[PDB]
Each structure stands twice: as C-alpha cells, then as structure tokens.
C-alpha cells in the first residue's frame, strides 16, 4: 500500500497538468490556434497574454508540490539506508527498529521503487510463575547471581537465566559475594554449594 500510494499521487499531479490546458483563464478561447486565426496582432497580444500567465501558473504549482513531495521520499530513502546497514549488515539493539521482538537477522528483497525487509526475531512463548529473591545469605555474607535470577519451585532454590527457564544448582562459580546480610531488603536463607 505504501508503494502504490506514491504511484497514485504522481499520476494525479500529471493529469491535472494536462487538464489545465483546456482552460481559457479569461481569454476568448483555450486554443491558441483559434486566437491566432481570428485576431490581428495588437488585439491578439491581450488574449495570448492571458493564456501565458495562466499556464505559467499551472507549471509553477506542479513544480513546487513536486519539490515538497521529493523531500519526503529522500527522508524515507535515508531510513532505508540505515536499516540496510544496521539490520542486514549487523545485529541491532535498538528496540523496534528491526521488527518486533529481539532481533536476530534481516533479509533484503527488491520491490518496484522500493525495498522489502524480512525481519527474523525471537519471541518468548509460554511462561510460568515462580518465587524470587534479590540475594541469598549463607555465612553472614550476601550472594548475588553473576548473570540471572534466583528462583524457587516451592522447596529448592535455583539460579536461571532470564529469557529461558533452565535451572541450576547455586554454587560459588555462578554467584559472587559482597557485604553483610542485614543490608539487603528481602534476603533469603539458603546454602551455597562449593564445587571444589
């Protein structure tokens, strides 16, 4: 639809330019060959000067509205040259720039006077409720996860990544230690296993 509306606006403007050649603008005719075959040179000038003035007006209005319309195809072609660099030749972190979801890759296809981009994205499906906690107190020390969240299936405590449920055992090689236990609002007693 966005490509067809450009062809429709560029054709209404050229049909208005042809149709305005059949207006007389105050003269005795719209045909220039009938003014010239009916009037002597002094009288003819006053009639051809009305056609010249009115037809110069029609060309001037066409050209002005083509300059405004060409300035927004240039804005739209600069956006498409940015999406070719950042969505096709790279992987983008800007939200909703290349599609809907988390961007993986894009594929460029050619259309008439245009371009079509096929955005491949990642969408997260069915979810589940869990219980969570900001930190875990073990030996008078708080432990925070290195990359993930602390979840609980009801009895045990795991650590998982944020975009896929894949729970694991809380060891000292996926957490880190800082500070005391009385400073974190919501800390939870559990054990931190030691792999060595």
């Amino acid at each position: 639809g966005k490509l067809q509306d450009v062809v429709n606006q560029n054709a209404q403007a050229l049909n208005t330019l042809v149709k305005q050649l059949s207006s007389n603008f105050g003269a005795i005719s719209s045909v220039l060959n009938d003014i010239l075959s009916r009037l002597d040179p002094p009288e003819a000038e006053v009639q051809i000067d009305r056609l010249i003035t009115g037809r110069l007006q029609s060309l001037q209005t066409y050209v002005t509205q083509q300059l405004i319309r060409a300035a927004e195809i240039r804005a739209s072609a600069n956006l498409a040259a940015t999406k070719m660099s950042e969505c096709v030749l790279g992987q983008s972190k800007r939200v909703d720039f290349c599609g809907k979801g988390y961007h993986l890759m894009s594929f460029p296809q050619s259309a008439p006077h245009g371009v079509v981009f096929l955005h491949v994205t990642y969408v997260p499906a069915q979810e589940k409720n869990f219980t969570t906690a900001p930190a875990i107190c073990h030996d008078g020390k708080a432990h925070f996860p290195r990359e993930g969240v602390f979840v609980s299936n009801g009895t045990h405590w795991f650590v998982t990544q944020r975009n896929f449920y894949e729970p694991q055992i809380i060891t000292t090689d996926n957490t880190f230690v800082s500070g005391n236990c009385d400073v974190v609002i919501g800390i939870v007693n559990n054990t931190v296993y030691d792999p060595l």
Binding site: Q12, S22, F25, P124
Partner: protein, 186 residues
C-alpha cells in the same frame, strides 16, 4: 461563481492538498501512542520498593482520568485569541468565509488511556511488554538490572536502596515546581 469556472480546477486541487495534511495528523498520533495492543492496569497494591509514583499515575477522583502532572500541562498551553482557532476550533457556532476545523480521531481521553497503559506496563513488567507478553518482576529487582546495564554492579543498588528511592522522590517533586511557576517550559 461563473467567472471562477474559467480557471479550471484550481479548487479541487487546493482541497486535495489540505486533506492530505489532515489525514496525516491522525497518522502522527497513532505512530506515537498506539504502540501496545493490551491496556494494562496497575494493581491496587503499591509496594514499589519505596518509589512513589502517585504524581504520574492516574487518579479516579476526576472525570478526566489524567495524572496530576498531566493536568498542570493542560492548564498551561493556551491561546490569547490571536487568530481564528479560538473562534472555531475548541467547543459549535460557525465562522465566516468557509473556514472550518475538523476534530481529531482519538479524543483527549483516549490518548490518556494509552499513556497509562505504557506506564502500568513499565512499572510492573520492565521491558518485556514491548517484545511479547508482559512478565512481572519486582520493581527493586528491575532497577538492579538497569544498574547492571550501565556498568555498575547490582549490589550497589541493594545496599543504597533507601537513598536511591529518596533522591528519585525529591526529583519528581521539583518537576511540579518547574511547572507550577509561570515561567513555562512549554
């Protein structure tokens, strides 16, 4: 009106131009505000870790379901009757010479319902509602992953949580005073 017929079609062409402008003003609003297809509501509990969002969330004690800050903005943009839109636009009784004002498609209370669904989805979900289905997370645990995205470790949030929530609350309080003084930024 019969001498005007000699100038061809200069007036189906001028009305065609002002209608493309008017159709485009409605596409401008749906581009900005209509970016979610679910209308989220915020829960009646307000345990947001100590962060106080009462001045930007809507209150039901008004017919216009706008927030407190959204009402200082609406009593600040005005007109000194310097032209013609005050003579026709906001209502009507018609004006002379064939000049009219068309109404927008989304009303002013439809736009405020859109910006309360973006606020309720940020506070309760984080960023997950803009990429799929909204998955809830506690608000202090959400703020620790935004510290972690600027290069500060997440234990700096939890150890300074009461101080961080106090600096935020006093900074929303100064937005009002910069919008209650008559020296308007609008």
């Amino acid at each position: 009106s019969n001498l005007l017929l000699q100038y061809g079609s200069f007036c189906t062409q001028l009305n065609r131009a002002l209608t493309g402008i008017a159709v485009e003003q409605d596409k401008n609003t749906q581009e900005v505000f209509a970016q979610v297809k679910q209308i989220y509501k915020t829960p009646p509990i307000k345990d947001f870790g100590g962060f106080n969002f009462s001045q930007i969330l809507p209150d039901p004690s008004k017919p216009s379901k706008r927030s407190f800050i959204e009402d200082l903005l609406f009593n600040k943009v005005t007109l000194a009757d310097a032209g013609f839109i005050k003579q026709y636009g906001d209502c009507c009784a018609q004006k002379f010479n064939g000049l009219t004002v068309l109404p927008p498609l989304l009303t002013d209370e439809m736009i405020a319902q859109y910006t309360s669904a973006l606020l309720a989805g940020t506070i309760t979900s984080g960023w997950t509602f803009g990429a799929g289905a909204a998955l809830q997370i506690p608000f202090a645990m959400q703020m620790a992953y935004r510290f972690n995205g600027i290069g500060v470790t997440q234990n700096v949030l939890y150890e300074n949580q009461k101080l961080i929530a106090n600096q935020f609350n006093s900074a929303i309080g100064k937005i009002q005073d910069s919008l209650s003084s008559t020296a308007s930024a609008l």
